[PDB]
């Protein structure tokens, strides 16, 4: 069992962004290009050992049509066994996190055009990961990534989540933890802890979700002074036919946070359709409008963008 | 449909340069080297959407045979839509210009073993292209990058071209119009147009081409001078049952450029045969001679190599 | 005839290195991390020319299943040409040494979990290679790299090597000749030489193998000071039904190297055992033992690991 898949993701991509500061408009930029919007292609393969036992391995790359990307399993790539027991995998692999919900549905590469901000400690890393096998609806997920695949400002980490699924209905969540995080050009992040909770519906016809997220951490200043950010996100999507139009709202706690993300609180919405020509290709069009200000000093974007996603 | 394709080729090539001052040799330097001719592998598939319509992909990267490249999708990938309309492509494209003729159809690495200098404004680039259907011999394609895919000194540029066949016969035309063009080492130049008209005949035991190429601008200097350069090539090949020699020669007229390139006047002529082991397989040999003296300050580039070549 | 193939292995490795200095402990560092084994993935084709002449070609790359490599054909990459007259190819290549033996069969990437020190020579190179048809259990090879495929402050390099086979016993011999060769830290040597000779017998359920290696060259010091390199690396192999343990044993002589890797004497040992759940795939576990000292400035160290092994 040796298979090539992948996902080729493109479109176009127009945006604006508005500074005012209490004088109105104090800056005005925008962004009008051809974007990729994550394209990927893979190997993988499974074989069958006997007793119900399987080895698996995946081999996955970006693929940007644009041409920008370079280097081989810097998407998921692992090795590992499957069977009774559950599922063990080493090698690059998602945090528990990034797999709790699919919080964020948008193809785009603007952050105005999907749920991007409370998406972002999302992350892969080389790890080892455990994911039962599923019994009346419930799996779950253990993962432990070392203090030396972590480099040298940054220790081990721990992640967890469970899952439940019945029908349509499901609930899943994700946490982790960090000794120490290193933040590029900001002061660093200790006993860093993340968790998530998604809940909604899924099938067809009828999609929905609602997210949570709380991270906490200590800031490596002074004082070892507390940090904290909260976001939740909601979406809503129904199949009409061919066309799925969707609907997502996220909103982001005023949080304790130094960097100048920061994040101070924000609000948005993305809206969009899917057209299905197949199974496998749709197109994809979508609008955006972001607020990061108080009123006052207001940051609003405003995006839209049209695209074209083939899987194989 | 998802098909794994490509080409290798390499082979081995010797060159030796002599400048001459009017005091005979001021500089030789020679080369001897394995060399990779371009070789490349890509993945590309379609999908049937009915109605006539299709979805078009491809991911092409270079794949030297020496092991130096590195990247996906850095060759021509896209992703588009085809059916009655015409061809729509969005990503890395050729520009109208490249696809004009197969002005340079010499697999070689040596820049005196084919036709080289006037090919040099070829390119792909992150731009929409759109093919039209063929009418009675006549198809023609538009082109468009847009400035944020061009980068910060490189302005959206516009290409265009047409195409005419009947029979072996045929004559093609590419142009395009670049408002801001960076120049690397030298002034920037403005207002930058290029325009190749190619026409010949082609198909079993027969391939002739003539083209003529030209290219304006204005050099962002003192005085906004005026830059121009003026090239021919024409190539004859014909096919003796299995050998097909053919032999090339190339002129560059002694245009307006600053560059020390830059263009001066060239002469060059490219010889040599291929033989066919089977459809898919080729041994090359080729020969060359180029001059871009006056006479007096004359620079004579010999060189031969020998390849192969397979395409799969 | 196309053919997509590959290794994919990872496991995970700890360690602990000690110098003594006759206080007994100066220093003392630790590893223990997910490790990828050498991953690998690869293209290659052939095709039937007629008269038992073959076309061949390969592109072989690294992909680690830690996502860190990027390249194509960085592996052993190639194409040539096969038939009556032997074979013959050009590209990216084994050396001649690097195929003379197994001399290193572990998958491991922790210098101590492998006879390593002894296959650091080895290397690929773009080259032009020949290897003869066999004829009763003898063949051999011979390899040039040009000096322009070299770089700059490399000299051209001669490889030659002959096989014998007959059952299970084998006698392997592979040699390099190399007039200018750059030492990236220290003083570069020139006129370097190296020899391998491999003996042993291998089948199903036995394996064994000896190994003598000698490196010599002149330092590009004040006085053109001869340096000496003396090893010798022994592997023994019983397959119990799906179990297969090996021992390794390798020994440095105090050799004349400026270098202060250097070098000096050394001893080491490696055990270990594969387990293997199919023709493909395998589980791996070792330990390793490691000596650089003379009892007094001892380096001492320990290494363990497991590992997963799967072939496509």
Redesign the interface.
Same mark, same amino acid.
Request: aromatic letters at 10%.
């Given at each position: 069992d !040796?298979t090539?898949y #992948?996902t080729?993701? %493109? #479109? !176009?991509e127009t945006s604006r962004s508005v500074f005012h500061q209490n004088g109105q408009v104090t800056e005005v930029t925008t %962004?009008?290009? /051809?974007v &990729?919007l994550g394209?990927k292609?893979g190997?993988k $393969?499974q074989?069958d050992? +006997?007793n119900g036992?399987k %080895?698996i391995?995946q =081999?996955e790359?970006? %693929?940007?049509?644009? +041409?920008? &990307?370079? #280097?081989? +399993?810097?998407?998921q790539?692992? /090795? $590992?066994?499957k069977g009774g027991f559950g599922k063990l995998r !080493? $090698?690059?692999l998602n945090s528990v996190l990034k797999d709790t919900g699919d919080i964020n549905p948008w193809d785009s590469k603007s952050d105005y055009l999907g749920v991007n901000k409370i998406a972002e400690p999302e992350a892969?890393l /080389?790890? =080892?990961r455990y994911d039962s096998p599923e019994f009346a609806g419930l799996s779950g997920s253990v993962q432990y990534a070392?203090? &030396?695949?972590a480099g040298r400002h940054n220790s081990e980490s721990y992640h967890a989540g469970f899952n439940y699924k019945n029908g349509g209905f499901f609930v899943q969540y994700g946490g982790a933890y960090k000794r120490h995080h290193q933040v590029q050009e900001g002061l660093n992040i200790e006993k860093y802890q993340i968790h998530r909770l998604v809940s909604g519906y899924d099938n067809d016809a009828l999609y929905a979700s609602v997210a949570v997220q709380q991270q906490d951490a200590k800031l490596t200043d002074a004082s070892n002074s507390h940090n904290s950010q909260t976001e939740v996100a909601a979406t809503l999507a129904y199949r009409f036919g061919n066309v799925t139009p969707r609907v997502s709202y996220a909103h982001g706690f005023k949080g304790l946070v130094a960097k100048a993300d920061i994040g101070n609180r924000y609000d948005q919405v993305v809206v969009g359709a899917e057209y299905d020509?197949?199974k496998?290709?749709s197109a994809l069009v979508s609008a955006g409008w972001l607020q990061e200000g108080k009123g006052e000093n207001k940051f609003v974007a405003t995006a839209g963008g049209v695209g074209?996603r083939?899987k194989?």
């Open positions: !040796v090539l #992948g080729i993701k %493109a #479109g !176009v %962004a009008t290009g /051809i &990729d394209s292609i190997f $393969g074989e050992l +006997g036992l %080895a391995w =081999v790359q970006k %693929a940007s049509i644009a +041409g920008t &990307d370079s #280097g081989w +399993g810097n998407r790539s692992f /090795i $590992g066994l !080493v $090698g690059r892969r /080389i790890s =080892v070392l203090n &030396d695949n020509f197949s496998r290709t074209l083939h194989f």
